[PDB]
Nucleic acid binder design. Structure first.
Ligand SMILES: [Mg+2]
Ligand SMILES: [Mg+2]
Ligand SMILES: [Mg+2]
Ligand SMILES: [Mg+2]
Ligand SMILES: [Mg+2]
Ligand SMILES: [Mg+2]
Ligand SMILES: [Mg+2]
Ligand SMILES: [Mg+2]
Ligand SMILES: [Mg+2]
Ligand SMILES: [Mg+2]
Ligand SMILES: [Mg+2]
Ligand SMILES: [Mg+2]
Ligand SMILES: [Mg+2]
Ligand SMILES: [Mg+2]
Ligand SMILES: [Mg+2]
Ligand SMILES: [Mg+2]
Ligand SMILES: [Mg+2]
Ligand SMILES: [Mg+2]
Ligand SMILES: [Mg+2]
Ligand SMILES: [Mg+2]
Ligand SMILES: [Mg+2]
Lengths: 52, 53, 187, 147, 53, 53, 125
RNA sequence: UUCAAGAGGGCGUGAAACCGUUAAGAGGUAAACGGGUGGGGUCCGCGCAGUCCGCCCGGAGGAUUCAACCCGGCGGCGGGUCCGGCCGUGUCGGCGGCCCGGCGGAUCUUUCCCGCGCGGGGGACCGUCCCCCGACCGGCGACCGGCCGCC
RNA sequence: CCGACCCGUCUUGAAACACGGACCAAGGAGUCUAACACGUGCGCGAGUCGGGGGCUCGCACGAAAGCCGCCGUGGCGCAAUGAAGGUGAAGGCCGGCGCGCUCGCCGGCCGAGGUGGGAUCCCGAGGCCUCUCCAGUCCGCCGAGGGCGCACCACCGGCCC
RNA sequence: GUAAGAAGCCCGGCUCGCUGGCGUGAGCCGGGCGUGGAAUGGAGUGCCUAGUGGGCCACUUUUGGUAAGCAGAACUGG
RNA sequence: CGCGCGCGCGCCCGCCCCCGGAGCCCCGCGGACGCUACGCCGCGACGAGUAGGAGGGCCGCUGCGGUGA
């Protein structure tokens, strides 16, 4: 039921959007895992450039 | 620009030495608690850890 | 009893700024005194505009200022604003000015001082001219906002050049029944 | 902040702000944007005209990178370069006439909205407009095309 | 999936940092915050750089 | 105020809106006091109407 | 500046007390101990304060030195004086008036002093 | 026995409805209720007078230091004939650090080179941060040693 | 002594022969996200935002904080219009070459046009109180009258598709 | 329902592919002239916006009906 | 327009300190017992209320950050 002079909108929520939500709470640990992998590779390839 | 006086050093038993430093222009910046309160209360949330049932 | 009406016995003006910016409030302490203790109305106006909100204090552009002070008689006279001064890069020849305001942008600040100009605050104003003598009040375009295009009579009507609220601008979003003779009608 | 709301003020008040003759029942008009032709015809003829129908051709697989032409006017042209340039011109009287690439600063077509001060500038751009080409020659400059 | 966190514009956070330093001088404010301070010899208190060791 | 950071890539301090806050020192200057009316300290109250007749 | 210090310290301060529809302040050197601009020791370039002697005889007077601020250790001057309560008030009255040191605090000082000396006797036999 | 069983094996504290008893009071228009007074009890404070307190002046009694005025030291306020010196700003005068210090430039030299249309350091040039002396406003609430008066 | 029918709720209308209700303690009912419109408050300003990622802390705090040739790839904005192909926002005044033809060619000056209303500001005859005459410099205010005219409103006109 | 004055009256001059015996009309310019019947009081303008969308009575006028504490309307007040 | 108009003091002529305090209701030297300016003071008019809308709450309940030596 609309009213005085707003927008018309079409939101995409008529499915079951709620079993399938995704939290970005593991954002830092994801960063931390990478460094320790990114360091260690460059230690494995010792003098070779780290970038590649 | 405003005044920038001379601050004095105190050695590790008191004992004001002869070193002097003119203070920076930070200690003449304006003082606004509303901006501090806002920035505090809004950044003190980002350390939370969720809860739920 | 008394047959009168109380629907219009409170007035809906301001009495004080709604904010806690303390530098603002000291200015307000000052101009109340001058408005209370002087025979002028310049003081009154300024007091009224320090209470106003920010959409009631739009920014003034360096361009308009020059046009409004290059007019005859306004030579040697101070310019006075109760808001912000921006820059307009569509202007090359910046002459000597004596502006007073609350805020001033940075690029605008430099050019004004490099022509030999000068920048004042409301404190140093009231020491140079407590009563507003030798001044020019100015104001920005209070209906410059894009909000005022949606107002007025409604669309879907004749003789209403009014903008609607639409998600996206394209080919499928209006431009049909209501806007072509070939499909329904046309106001 | 729950403590600044108006559910903290309708305690005691029996109906929580929604009437007694008519009540906050579930979905009493429809559910969504239903009824543009039936029993909401008036909001959509009035405040949203052009909604129902169909118009225009169809372009099926449309790529918005082919159609790309960032625009600029003349007033906002001397700002692509610094201030050394515009001042060292009109000076030493050789016929300096500097060069201004727009495709460097992210612009392709040139438009003739404003005016510009008298120096004999040169311009390089992919496209031009008619009036823009005129104003430049009027001041004593030129126009140049590139790929 | 509540909204626990917040973003705040960088220029504001830098402003406030400048403000807190300013009022770190101005003895009156330190007193009011409850710091027994009435015997230090100078309030922007500074020492030799030996004490890092 | 004159230069900039050299460790932040663009940051000049905040600018003051109100230079002199010494309000009492202002209002007691001669310049303003010359430009004032007189005050009025006398105080008037609810007079009681007596009957002339 | 003073007002600037004040516009922060109206409502938020450790020396502040707000109960029973009353409002007091306990900062040192506050005559009349109320939350005010005129009566506050930490705000002004000139202030006076009055306390009792620690040994338990006489009055201690306190005045600020005006020259080196921002180094609170040596910003305050003290004297202790012990006489017959008519010399004691007259001495105070002479300090303030003849040096013009914040002269809108004259009688407030005197009342605080007399209160102390009245207490600083055998109030009980 | 335990500080405690007024903590006694489903035993921390231990509400209300509902009951038993004791003390007081009342009773034919079911009870309860609002406003206004009266009477009676339970407790608080009289005091077993409550005669409340404080300034100056007058009087009669006794008492021991100082102050009044001088001298010596100490501390502080104020001053301007701006006494002498600092320091700080605001542009200026000296381009004087601009290479005796760096940052940047859609300005040139590509007057050079480095590896060869170019990527970089050089050379000018422009701005922008800083050195030597002179000035004044705003010497302002930025500190001394002075001399003077006052406390 | 006078006054005085039981609360909630539906209702034109309830003390009702209209429903609910024996009594007590505890629980109990306008939320969270996503998007939009407007109003207010803060910051920067023709620009403004690092939210994704990376450099520094082992993470006691703290899964924070600071920083970036990322410094803007990009998004919102600065330019509209048309189904589309596609086009794409200022004038005049004076003098030279054709006939001011509601018209094309060489040189300078100004320049976002005007009408009406318009908070404030500006100039100002004669002065308001001057223990007396005249001379009469600083300062308010008057006040005749006269001008520069902000935003905003109504109209005229002009430019783009 | 209109009108009771400054958005008024008057003087003079300019432009017009409109109309044309000659002329009219409209628009622009520049000047001269202030109280315009009574009694009252501060006006104007713009955004966001809820609850409502079952009605009832009385004088007077009034339609159907034998009448109605009946059904349906106009005026004002409750 | 007769509660000042030239009043007073030395010797017309002159003085013409004057509130670091005159003298009683204006003192143009600075200040309220009031000045938490988000404060204090003074005048004058008004007060019905369902659905509903707004404001003030030193009214309250549980927890976090600082603070009450
Ligand atoms: Mg809406
Ligand atoms: Mg009412
Ligand atoms: Mg109202
Ligand atoms: Mg209600
Ligand atoms: Mg509601
Ligand atoms: Mg209900
Ligand atoms: Mg209904
Ligand atoms: Mg026990
Ligand atoms: Mg027990
Ligand atoms: Mg038990
Ligand atoms: Mg019992
Ligand atoms: Mg009803
Ligand atoms: Mg019924
Ligand atoms: Mg009922
Ligand atoms: Mg019945
Ligand atoms: Mg039912
Ligand atoms: Mg039942
Ligand atoms: Mg409960
Ligand atoms: Mg907003
Ligand atoms: Mg409605
Ligand atoms: Mg009411």
């Amino acid at each position: 039921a609309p009213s005085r002079n707003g927008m018309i909108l079409k939101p995409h929520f008529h499915k079951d959007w709620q079993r399938r939500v995704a939290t970005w709470f593991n954002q830092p640990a994801r960063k931390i895992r990478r460094r320790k992998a990114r360091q260690a590779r460059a230690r494995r390839i010792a003098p070779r450039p780290a970038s590649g | 620009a405003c005044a920038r006086p001379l601050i004095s050093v105190y050695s590790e038993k008191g004992e004001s030495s002869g070193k002097n430093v003119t203070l920076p222009a930070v200690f003449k910046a304006p003082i606004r608690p509303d901006i501090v309160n806002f920035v505090h209360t809004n950044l003190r949330k980002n350390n939370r850890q969720p809860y739920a049932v | 009893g008394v047959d009168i009406r109380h629907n219009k016995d409170r007035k809906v003006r301001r009495k004080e700024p709604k904010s806690q910016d303390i530098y603002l409030r000291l200015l307000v302490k000052l101009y109340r005194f001058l408005a209370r203790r002087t025979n002028s109305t310049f003081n009154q106006v300024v007091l009224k505009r320090l209470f106003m909100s920010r959409t009631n204090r739009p920014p003034l552009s360096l361009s308009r200022m020059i046009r409004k002070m290059k007019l005859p008689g306004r030579e040697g006279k101070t310019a006075v604003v109760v808001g912000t001064i921006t820059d307009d890069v569509r202007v090359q020849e910046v002459p000597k000015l004596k502006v007073c305001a609350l805020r001033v942008s940075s690029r605008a600040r430099s050019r004004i001082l490099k022509a030999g100009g000068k920048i004042l605050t409301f404190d140093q104003l009231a020491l140079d001219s407590p009563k507003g003598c030798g001044t020019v009040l100015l104001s920005g375009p209070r209906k410059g906002r894009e909000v005022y295009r949606h107002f007025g009579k409604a669309p879907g009507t004749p003789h209403s050049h009014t903008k609607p609220y639409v998600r996206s601008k394209g080919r499928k979003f209006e431009r049909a029944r209501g806007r072509r003779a070939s499909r329904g009608y046309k106001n | 902040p729950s403590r600044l709301r108006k559910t903290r003020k309708l305690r005691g008040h029996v109906s929580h702000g929604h009437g007694r003759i008519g009540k906050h029942r579930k979905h009493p008009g429809g559910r969504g944007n239903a009824g543009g032709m039936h029993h909401h015809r008036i909001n959509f003829d009035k405040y949203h005209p052009g909604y129902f129908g169909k118009v225009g051709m169809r372009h099926y697989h449309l790529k918005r990178n082919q159609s790309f032409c960032p625009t600029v006017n003349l007033d906002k042209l001397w700002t692509l370069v610094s201030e050394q340039t515009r001042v060292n011109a009109a000076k030493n009287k050789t016929g300096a006439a500097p060069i201004i690439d727009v495709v460097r600063s992210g612009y392709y077509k040139v438009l003739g909205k404003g005016k510009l001060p008298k120096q004999p500038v040169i311009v390089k751009a992919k496209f031009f407009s008619r009036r823009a080409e005129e104003k430049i020659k009027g001041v004593g400059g030129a126009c140049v095309l590139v790929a | 999936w509540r909204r626990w966190h917040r973003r705040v514009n960088t220029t504001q956070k830098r402003y406030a940092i400048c403000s807190a330093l300013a009022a770190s001088a101005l003895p009156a404010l330190v007193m009011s915050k409850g710091h027994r301070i009435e015997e230090v010899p100078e309030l922007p208190l500074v020492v030799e750089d030996k004490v890092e060791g | 105020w004159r230069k900039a950071a050299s460790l932040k890539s663009n940051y000049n301090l905040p600018m003051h809106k109100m230079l002199n806050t010494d309000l009492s020192r202002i209002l007691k200057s001669p310049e303003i006091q010359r430009a004032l009316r007189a005050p009025r300290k006398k105080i008037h109250r609810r007079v009681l109407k007596k009957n002339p007749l | 500046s003073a007002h600037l210090q004040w516009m922060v310290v109206r409502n938020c301060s450790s020396f502040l007390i707000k109960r029973n529809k009353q409002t007091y302040s306990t900062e040192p050197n506050n005559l009349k101990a109320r939350n005010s601009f005129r009566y506050n020791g930490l705000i002004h370039r000139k202030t006076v304060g009055v306390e009792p002697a620690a040994d338990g005889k006489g009055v201690v007077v306190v005045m600020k030195r005006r020259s080196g601020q921002r180094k609170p250790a040596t910003s305050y001057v003290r004297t202790t004086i012990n006489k017959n309560a008519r010399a004691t008030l007259s001495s105070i009255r002479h300090m303030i008036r003849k040096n013009k040191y914040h002269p809108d605090l004259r009688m407030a000082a005197i009342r605080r002093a007399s209160a102390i000396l009245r207490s600083q006797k055998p109030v009980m036999v």
